[PDB]
Amino acid sequence: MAFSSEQFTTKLNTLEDSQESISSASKWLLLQYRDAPKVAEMWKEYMLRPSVNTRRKLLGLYLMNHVVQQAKGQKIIQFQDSFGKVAAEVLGRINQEFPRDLKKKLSRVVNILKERNIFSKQVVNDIERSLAAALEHH
């Protein structure tokens, strides 16, 4: 079948920090448009596991970026929403395990998404205040 346990995870265990495998894996997810909320719950759980390091979170971070962008483009609103719904908490947690350097890279990706208006400006404020709380200072 097109679905199986941890298919998303084993994917991220094969991805690299660049658009080659990242965009390819994104297009797979963009074809799972029917199952977008299902794959989204697997995405958050995958990176929420500490059974994977910040490097693994960084791959999935780039993967999400290109997935939500393409979904925003055509008409796969289910994906930009399904990832946007978890993005506030999820990205908010990445800031709690990333070194300041990866936090800056993540922040840029988040900004680029905000500028592209990928998520709703409402969901953006959820991500913003979440990452803001995850600045570890106030």
């Binding site: 690299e16 920090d17 660049s18 658009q19 080659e20 495998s21 990242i22 965009s23 780039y62 970026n65 290109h66 962008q69 393409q70 925003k72 483009g73 055509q74 008409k75 840029r108 990706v109 680029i112 500028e115 592209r116 990928i118």
Partner: peptide
């Protein structure tokens, strides 16, 4: 593979 990458360059409205 790990070619060049800048998250502001890839798709956003590539097709309907």
């Amino acid at each position: 593979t790990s070619p060049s990458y800048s998250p502001t360059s890839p798709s956003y409205s590539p097709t309907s």
